[PDB]
Amino acid sequence: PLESQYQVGPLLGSGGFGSVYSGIRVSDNLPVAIKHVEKDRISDWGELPNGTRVPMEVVLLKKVSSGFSGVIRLLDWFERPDSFVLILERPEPVQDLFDFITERGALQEELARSFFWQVLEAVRHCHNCGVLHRDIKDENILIDLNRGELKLIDFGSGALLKDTVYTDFDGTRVYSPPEWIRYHRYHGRSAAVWSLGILLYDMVCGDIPFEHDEEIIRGQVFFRQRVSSECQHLIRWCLALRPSDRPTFEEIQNHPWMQDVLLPQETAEIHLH
Numbered sequence: 001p002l003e004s005q006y007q008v009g010p011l012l013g014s015g016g017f018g019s020v021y022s023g024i025r026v027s028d029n030l031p032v033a034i035k036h037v038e039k040d041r042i043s044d045w046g047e048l049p050n051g052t053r054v055p056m057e058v059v060l061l062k063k064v065s066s067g068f069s070g071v072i073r074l075l076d077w078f079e080r081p082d083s084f085v086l087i088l089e090r091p092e093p094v095q096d097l098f099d100f101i102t103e104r105g106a107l108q109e110e111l112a113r114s115f116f117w118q119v120l121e122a123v124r125h126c127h128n129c130g131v132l133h134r135d136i137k138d139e140n141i142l143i144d145l146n147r148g149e150l151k152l153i154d155f156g157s158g159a160l161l162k163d164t165v166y167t168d169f170d171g172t173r174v175y176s177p178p179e180w181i182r183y184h185r186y187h188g189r190s191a192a193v194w195s196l197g198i199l200l201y202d203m204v205c206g207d208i209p210f211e212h213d214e215e216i217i218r219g220q221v222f223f224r225q226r227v228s229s230e231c232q233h234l235i236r237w238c239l240a241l242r243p244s245d246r247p248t249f250e251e252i253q254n255h256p257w258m259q260d261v262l263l264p265q266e267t268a269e270i271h272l273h
């Protein structure tokens with residue numbers, strides 16, 4: 001049923017997440033994205049409500065794809081002999097946050113506030129659906145350049161949310177928290193806050209704070225760009241070494257620097273058009 005129902009187009013890239021092609025749904029001419037994932041490479045499996053064995057990524061996507069969110073939705077999927085195939089939304093025009101920052105450099109605080117907020121809502125939604133993304137970073141965040149709306153991709157590293165300790169991590173090293181580096185254990189929310197702490201620094205300074213493990217474990221943040229006494233506070237609080245000294249989402253979202261956030265449409269007018 002696959003090859004008939006959608007119309008494949010260009011490639012859009014590949015990595016440790018598979019190979020994505022542009023594509024159109026014939027039924028409506030919705031833009032979509034088609035993501036092929038080989039079975040032989042899938043490390044992490046699960047089971048859907050009806051009790052079928054699929055890749056975790058699919059489980060997680062289905063859980064977060066109900067109604068609107070800052071999360072690129074799974075519209076459908078297929079199984080093949082050696083691949084799985086996932087149809088996803090394709091916002092148009094779009095750009096990932098890595099390219100954006102690689103182009104425009106560090107972001108004005110007003111713009112970083114808008115983006116960071118949207119990531120926070122998006123991550124709150126995942127956590128609400130029982131999902132931990134486990135790999136939050138610039139290149140896993142897309143920007144719909146017209147509506148000013150950020151959306152969250154790949155879930156390939158990613159787990160069912162749980163309150164006990166995690167001992168695996170197939171994510172991004174430089175975004176990993178000191179507790180993991182040192183002890184090979186961490187807890188979801190606290191770890192996620194850390195990664196957000198890294199995300200926010202990247203946004204305002206145009207590059208990540210830490211390169212090597214020694215730098216992470218040492219937890220000391222040097223600012224290369226002019227950033228507000230207040231943003232620095234929020235970043236540092238998010239990158240506290242002791243997980244228990246990091247903020248909750250509420251606390252992050254009630255932090256002074258997070259107040260008077262621009263809505264997505266006005267963000268695009270001022271900062272993207």
Ligand SMILES: CSc1ccc2c(c1)N(CC[C@H]1CCCCN1C)c1ccccc1S2
Nearest residue numbers: 012013017020033088089090139153154155
């Ligand atoms: C653009 S449209 C679009 C819409 C939905 C997704 C994808 C692309 N990509 C991003 C492609 C890749 C391109 C090279 C630069 C790094 N990035 C991650 C993807 C990737 C990973 C998991 C899920 C997905 S779903």
